[PDB]
Structures are given as C-alpha cells and as structure tokens.
Design a binder for this molecule. Structure first.
Ligand code: NI
Ligand code: NI
Lengths: 140, 308, 260
C-alpha cells in the first residue's frame, strides 16, 4: 500500500525544500551554524544524530522551539516538520522498530533574534547531515 | 510616627546602574527621610544602609547575575520623630551580560558608541579578549574597539549608515563575545532616514495650508508614535531653522497615496512657521532636520482669468 | 396537487399505512419560492389540509483549488450556485485531515472541522488554508445544516503537493548566436518544485502582433536551448513556462518577455 521508494523520494524532496526555505531567510545564510553560542545549549545542535530515534527526538525539540517563534514561515515549516516526523514514522514502520516520545521562554523574551537565527542555521546543518545519511542504510 | 514606605521598585538605568524608587506618604504634612537597607547576593554578598531625603536611590555599576533585596523605612525630617518599620523586602535579579546602553535609536552618519561587560563562568574576562560582533555575520574591526578598562570593553561607529532591514527586523544585533564564545543576549541598533522633505502648499484664497510628507522610511518601526511638531514666532524665519523648545503637535491625516497630510486654517500670513517631524519610540524621541517657512512665499498662483 | 402519482410507485406497508416511492430521483426544479415538491396524501379525490415537502438538492459541489507559488498559502474555490434558492439553512465547508496522503476512497472520517470561507464578487466561496503541511491528506465537502438535518456534498480529498502552482522560470535571456545565427535561450528555474520539469517556450518576431511558435524541452537538466530563426537581424520576443515533468500540477505563467 505504502510505496517505500516513493516515500524515500518524497522525503528527499521535502528535505531539499526545507533547505531552500532556510535559504530564503537572508539574515540566516551569513551566520555560522557551527558557532557555539552560550545559553542555547538545550537546542539539539550539531552532535552526531546517527539514529532514527535520535532524529525523531531532535526534530521534536526543534518543533517545540519553532512553535514559540512568532514567524509565519517557520511555523508552517514546523508543520512540515510534522510531516517529516510522520514520514520517519512510516520509514520506521517499514524497518520494524518501536519509537517512544523550560528555559527557552527566558531567552525568547530577552534575545529573540539570536534564538531564531541560531535555531535555523543549526537546523539547516542538522538536516543537511541527515540528508547526507538518509541513504547509508538509516537504522532505528 | 510615619508609615512604612510603599511602592518598592527597582529598575536598571541606561548607564547600567540600579535605581530604587518608592512612593512617599502624600498624607504626611511633614518632610520625610528614608533609610534604604539593601543587600546584594552576588558572588560577593554585601549589605549596606543609606539615608536619603528623596524617593529615589542610585547604586553604580551593578554586578551581572546578582540578587538584590531592599527594605525601606521612613522618618520625620523635623523633630524627634520615630523611625517607621521597614518596608516589605523587594528582590531584583540581574542577567548574564551587561550592555552600555541596552539599545540605541539614531540617524544616519552619527557617532554611536557602546560598551560591554562579558561574564564567562563568574570570570569578567579582560577587554583585550572581548570581540564585538554585528548580527553574527561579520566581526567589528579592532580599530573601532576601545578599552574603557580591563573589564569594560568599548566600540564605536562613526558615519552610521542606515540600518538596512533584514527580514522583519529593523535593528542591528550587537554581541560582545569571549573570543569565539558568544552569549545569546544582544543590543539593538536603529538607524533611520530622518531626512523628511515637508511639502507645504497654500490655497488660492490664502486661507489654509496643506502640508504633505511621505513617511516611506518609517513604515518599519512598530510601537513608535509618529507626529508633526511645530512652533511659530512673530515674523519670518531666522536663517538657521531651529526649535524654540516650546512646540505643539499638529494632527495630520493619512492619504490614499500613503502620504500624511494636514491643513492649517486660518493662517497668520506674515508669521514665521517652523516645523519638523517627531517620532516617539520607547527608546526616546527623534526629530527631523527642522524647516521653517513663510506662508506667503509658498502660494500656488491661481490660473489667469477672463482670457479671450 | 398537480398530477396523480402512479400506483406502481405506491406500496401497502399496511392497511393503515400508505407508501409512495421515488427511485432514481430527478432534480426538484424550483417553482416560485418552492424548491421542493409539495406532496399531498389524500382521501381519494379531495383532501385534508395537510401537506409535506420533498427536496432533491444538487449538492455535487465542484471544489477546485490551488496552492500558492511559495507553498505558504492554499486556496479552494467552490460556487454555491445551486444553493442560491434556499434560506433558513446554513452552508459551510467541512474538512477532515489525516496524517499523510488520501485514502483511495474519498470518505468522511467521522472527526472533522469546519472551515471559514469568504464569498467573492465572482460568485464563488473561497477558503484559505494556512499554515501548510505539504503532505497531509485533506478531504473536504460542503455541509448544509437545515432544519431538516444535514446534507453533504460528495467528499473529495487533496494532497497539497499535487496542486502547487509553478512559479514562472526566472532570468530568461535570448540572444543571437555568433557565427551560427541561432536563437540561444537561457533561464533560471523557479525555486520550486523539486520535481523534474517539462518546459514550454513561445517565441516570435518583435511587434504588436507576434506569431507564437512553440518549442518543448523534456529534460530538466537542460538549462539552455538553441533554435533556428528565419530573420537573423530582428528583435525576437520570447516567453517561457514550466510544468512538472509528470504533469501533476499546473502550467506556470509565461516568463517575462526577452528581446533579442
Ligand atoms: Ni522666541
Ligand atoms: Ni485513520
């Protein structure tokens, strides 16, 4: 019923689509994704995301962060992140494996600009890594 | 016996200092002095008590990430008055990184400076290592840097360029960093094209003055009121357009072409009218380069009549 | 009270109960302000005052719609022309979304939500969904809540990615090839989509009236093309549009004219 090759291709197209979206935020392309910024250590930035359960919980946290950012583009994109998690749920169902499921507000009031720009450039890096490893037999 | 002071509040001044304010007894027909006992739970905890005649107290150079508990008591200034009981203690907390100023709103080409106090694991790093950063994109050059002290870092921008919007944001985000380690908090920079060409024109009957201006620049800052201020003196314009500080606002109306227009009627025909544009934001107030006018000189002629 | 209903359509539920039956109902054409049929069951020739109503409603609503070129807002249009006879009832759009794609049978999953929509001067109600899941399954229909109950249009589902409107290709340059006299055309693809695209190109001599000749590019990797032109020294006006190579979408608007 569910064509796994089709789902994999739609997943790749959606990832590249999200990448183009992040390419449209002019202010984010010039900010170093890998640069460490003290205070936002809870955001699951670049730290080998090498498993489906880690990928899922990473995108879940990123969604929780985006829900609090008042930009329309990133919010619908968080909606796209929902679609991405559901696609990963179908892929984990395809491979057979179970998948289980604070201080952000303070930085949101005191430093909103930094939180969005960082969250987005680190997200772009995490997703670019995920893309580079969505073909080397991803495992649960 | 006076009542305890009430309305205990602490705020952080622009200079990064602490001001404690409390409400005096309006019902008291006598002057009151107030003892403020304040304790800081910083890395170094200390307690102090001062006596002030006014309702405000100032403490210089607040420490980042510190607690402040304040109590105030009141006493009659004249006579053998009895000290009132201490007010309810009030607690104020500071944050990681200190800025001087927190924010700036200015115009193009100005000379605006800044200072940072960076806290890195309870270690106030030396200013020689503090690095200024513009919006996480380009580092500010060292030439514009300055050392107020070993702990206080400074930077300055001369010939400020107009803050070009990036996304919905109308302010440059300024960070001070412990070399490659950058904190999350920042400062906001607003540079606005304040040059407004006010176009006033006179009716053919010399009764009303229709003035126009396109605030095409301003449709980026929200929460800031925009208005037109003006002042008129007896006759004519001094060659230097300037503001007798007594000024009054003129209500003006939007037009379908996006311009703000408003009309003066009736008019003092031989009298000097100075005007400019006032932008009142939470940061402060910005004013356009003032311009003056004599109405009689800005009259559009009526078409010639009875032509055969 | 116009013509007698045939006995064949009559039925005897009991000696006390009479029955009529209308199989394969036709549209109840409205007469006056009476869109229904005013049925009378009567004691042979002449009658009691009692009367009843029968409604056949053309609820087959053609809900047709489009995703914007940024995949950031989607809008659906439906013309409530049929319902432009009934008052006292409520008309709305009801949609259910479930996680991914559409089930092969468009059907009302029991949980559903209403969608606020605005009538336009064109006589169509339009409903704008935003934000956007690109790959969620949205079935929807039109609910008519009348005093009688609830009627519903034939439900139809949609996947937004299928109804994306392609942006016109950008940065189209037309030039005359040196030493060959050909028309060299280049373009920049729209930022969306990620699918392979077919490309249609209309070109002609510059003028008030332009004869539009057409060329088609079938491979997405080809970012450029070259064609034969009879006149090697006249200005040519050219426009380009793109469609998904599989065709599951629309044809983009013609690109900005390029003058040789
Ligand atoms: Ni004066
Ligand atoms: Ni289901």
């Amino acid at each position: 019923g569910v064509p796994i090759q089709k789902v994999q291709d739609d997943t790749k197209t959606l990832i590249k689509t999200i990448v183009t979206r992040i390419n449209d935020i002019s202010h984010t392309q010039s900010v170093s994704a890998k640069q460490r910024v003290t205070g936002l250590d809870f955001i699951p930035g670049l730290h080998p995301i090498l498993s489906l359960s880690k990928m899922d919980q990473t995108l879940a946290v990123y969604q929780q962060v985006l829900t609090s950012l008042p930009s329309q583009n990133v919010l619908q994109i968080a909606n796209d992140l929902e679609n991405l998690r559901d696609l990963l749920h179908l892929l984990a169902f395809s491979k057979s494996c179970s998948l289980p499921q604070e201080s952000l507000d303070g930085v949101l009031e005191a430093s909103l600009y930094s939180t969005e720009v960082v969250a987005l450039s680190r997200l772009q890096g995490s997703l670019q890594d995920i893309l580079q490893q969505l073909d080397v037999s991803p495992e649960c | 016996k006076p009542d305890p002071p009430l309305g205990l509040h602490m705020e952080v001044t622009d200079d990064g200092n602490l001001k404690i304010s409390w409400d005096s007894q309006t019902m008291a027909p006598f002057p009151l002095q107030y003892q403020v006992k304040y304790l800081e739970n910083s890395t170094i905890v200390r307690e102090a008590a001062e006596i002030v005649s006014a309702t405000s107290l100032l403490v210089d150079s607040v420490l980042p990430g510190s607690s402040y508990e304040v109590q105030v008591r009141s006493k009659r200034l004249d006579g053998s008055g009895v000290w009132s009981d201490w007010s309810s203690p009030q607690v104020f907390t500071t944050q990681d990184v200190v800025y001087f100023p927190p924010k700036i709103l200015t115009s193009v080409g100005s000379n605006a400076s800044f200072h940072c106090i960076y806290k890195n694991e309870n270690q106030i790093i030396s200013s020689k290592q503090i690095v200024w950063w513009r919006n996480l994109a380009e580092k500010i050059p060292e030439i514009q840097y300055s050392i107020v002290s070993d702990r206080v870092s400074k930077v300055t921008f001369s010939n400020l360029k107009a803050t070009r919007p990036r996304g919905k944001f109308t302010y440059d985000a300024v960070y001070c960093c412990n070399e490659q380690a950058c904190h999350h908090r920042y400062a906001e920079l607003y540079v606005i094209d304040v040059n407004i060409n006010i176009s006033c024109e006179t009716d053919g009957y010399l009764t009303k003055m229709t003035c126009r201006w396109s605030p095409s620049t301003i449709q980026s800052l929200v929460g800031s009121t925009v208005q037109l201020r003006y002042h008129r003196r007896s006759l004519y314009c001094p060659d230097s357009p300037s503001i007798h500080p007594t000024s009054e606002p003129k209500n003006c109306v939007l037009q379908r072409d996006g311009f703000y227009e408003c009309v003066f009627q009736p008019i003092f025909l031989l009298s000097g009218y100075t005007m400019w544009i006032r932008i009142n934001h939470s940061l402060g107030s910005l004013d356009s380069p003032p311009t003056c006018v004599l109405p009689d000189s800005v009259v559009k002629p009526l078409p010639p009549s009875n032509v055969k | 009270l116009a013509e007698k209903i045939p006995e064949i359509q009559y039925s005897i539920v009991s000696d006390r109960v009479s029955k009529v039956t209308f199989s394969n109902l036709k549209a109840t054409r409205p007469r006056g302000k009476f869109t229904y049929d005013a049925v009378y069951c009567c004691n042979e020739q002449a009658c009691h005052h009692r009367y009843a109503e029968l409604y056949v409603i053309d609820v087959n609503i053609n809900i047709s719609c489009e995703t914007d070129g940024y995949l950031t807002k989607m809008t659906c249009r439906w013309s409530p022309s049929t319902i432009q006879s009934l008052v006292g009832s409520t008309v709305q759009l009801r949609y259910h979304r479930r996680s991914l794609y559409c089930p092969d049978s468009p059907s009302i999953h029991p949980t559903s939500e209403p969608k606020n929509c605005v009538l336009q001067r064109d006589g169509f109600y339009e409903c704008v969904f935003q934000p956007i899941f690109l790959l969620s399954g949205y079935t929807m229909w039109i609910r008519i809540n009348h005093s009688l109950g609830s009627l519903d249009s034939p439900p139809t589902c949609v996947l937004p990615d299928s109804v994306v409107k392609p942006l016109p290709p950008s940065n189209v340059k037309a030039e005359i090839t040196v030493n060959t006299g050909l028309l060299k055309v280049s373009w920049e693809k729209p930022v969306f989509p990620e699918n392979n695209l077919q490309f249609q190109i209309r070109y002609g001599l510059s003028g008030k009236e332009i004869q539009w000749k057409t060329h088609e590019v079938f491979d997405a990797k080809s970012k450029s093309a070259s064609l034969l032109v009879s006149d090697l020294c006249a200005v040519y006006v050219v426009q380009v549009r793109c469609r998904r190579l599989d065709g599951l979408g629309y044809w983009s608007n013609w690109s900005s004219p390029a003058y040789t």
